Amino acid sequence: APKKVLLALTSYNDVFYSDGMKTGVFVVEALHPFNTFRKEGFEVDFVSETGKFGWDEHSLAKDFLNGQDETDFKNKDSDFNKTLAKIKTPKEVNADDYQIFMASAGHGTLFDYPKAKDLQDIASEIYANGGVVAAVCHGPAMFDGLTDKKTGRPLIEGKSITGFTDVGETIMGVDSILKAKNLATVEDVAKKYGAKYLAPVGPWDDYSITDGRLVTGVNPASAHSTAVRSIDALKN
Amino acid sequence: APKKVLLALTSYNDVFYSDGMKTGVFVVEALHPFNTFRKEGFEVDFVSETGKFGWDEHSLAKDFLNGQDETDFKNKDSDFNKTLAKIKTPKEVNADDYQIFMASAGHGTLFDYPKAKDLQDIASEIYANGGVVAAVCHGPAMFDGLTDKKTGRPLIEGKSITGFTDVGETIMGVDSILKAKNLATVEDVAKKYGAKYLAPVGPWDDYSITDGRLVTGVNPASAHSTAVRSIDALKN
């Protein structure tokens, strides 16, 4: 019985940082989970609102992309790249074929995830069928408006989750940018929908939480842990 | 509430393991928090149900006690040992003089913490005063019967905590002992008092949670982080 994971990527790719660089998909937030799922025998399908995506340019730096990751990123024939090439649009997805819905991030998610009704329906269906919903970094942005098909309440209401920290936005000096673009942080979303936000000791620590079948991670360093947790949570 | 910490130690110190070794206070669960508090400018008072304690013999092994820790442990003139010499009984404690109540562990806590009503009242008072209640490893055994003075409900009811894992007990082969001695695991306590137990990915990982002013850690590897968390939590 083929075990499948639907890995969502932000479709937003545009100038964002003060240095003029663009945000978009944080490379390892897509690559590490991909590797973890593949290692465990899962098949992985990528998807974005538009079927297209761009890389967060800061995530391309050597500190965030090196060694085997860089090699896989550069090799056109890598499993990673060949799979990315087959990226789907929400309309091409059949929710019932997946056991796990994983939302990778990068600041780009703040632009499209909150309004991605079709991806939210897919995540909601996967969750209603006993599957797992997981998200790392700014991925929880997609929880804004995500409803639990069985209860009708926000899927994260009364749940414990983590995600990119407010302090992290401040340390990066992007908090003023978020305010200017009328974007909400992960902690903002958690507060709005009645979720309990639990923070890491430090903003860049590998930190993740498993609350039943809802799994969340804080940042790039938490991508792998988030993926591992989503696999383990299938028995929850 | 002066910058002072009350660090609780288990008073149980009897043969426990299959090899005949005794359990008791897990050295680094007392030492690491002690160093962290002292480093941040806090005065620290030790306390145990009987005013006495013994070391968990497995925690004395090189893998758990080495380097500077071993040096401080052996140095009879260390600030650690001089403070341990002044260990108090619950009756010699004034709850109003502490900002933080910290429960260190080792398997010994499973024997005395659940019935340590006097220490629980102290913890409850500190918490009611706006202070922090923290526990690491089996320390959450202290939460069995702990009441929130403001509501009359279990202090951990509706709260998210972590602590030593059931799987960890099985791996160590101590589950058979717990069953024989009619002891409850941390996860058992969490369920009995309405708390949400959030688990680490692996039983030995450095993992901790901050839920307002209630802080918890999973094991020896998490003692330092739990102490760090208890200090940062003083603003909740």
Class of domain A1-236: alpha beta
Active-site annotation of B, residues:
137-138, 169
Name the residue facing B210 among A199, A209, A211 (closest C-beta).
A199
Q: Are residues B109 and B12 in contact, defined by beta-carbon separation less than 8 angstroms?
A: yes
- What is the spatial distance between Cα B144 and Cα B184, in angstroms, rounded to a whole number? 10
Which residues, 6 or more positions from B171, have their beta carbon under 8 angstroms from its beta carbon?
A: B203
For CA atoms A225, A226, A227, A232, the dihedral sign is positive
Question: Which one of B32, B187, B201 makes the best mutation probe of the A interface by having the most chain A beta carbons within 10 Å?
Answer: B201
Q: Which residues of B touch A229 (CB under 8 A)?
A: 201
- What is the spatial distance between Cα B10 and Cα B48, in angstroms, rounded to a whole number? 6
The tally of CA atoms less than 13 A away on the side-chain side of residue B115 is 9
- What is the spatial distance between Cα A46 and Cα A86, in angstroms, rounded to a whole number? 7
Q: Which residues of B touch A209 (CB under 8 A)?
A: 198
Cα dist from B108 to A5, A66, B26, B112, whole Å? 44, 46, 9, 7
Sketch the domain layout of chain A as residue ranges.
1-236
CA distance B234 to chain A (A): 14
Q: Are residues B143 and B193 in contact, defined by beta-carbon separation less than 8 angstroms?
A: yes
- What is the spatial distance between Cα B165 and Cα A85, in angstroms, rounded to a whole number? 42
Amino acid at B203: P
Q: Please indicate the experimental technique that yielded this structure.
A: X-ray
How many interface pairs between A and B have CB atoms less than 8 angstroms apart?
Answer: 26
Q: Which residues of A touch B209 (CB under 8 A)?
A: 198
**What DSSP line would sit under B188-200, residue for residue?**
HHHHHTT-EE---
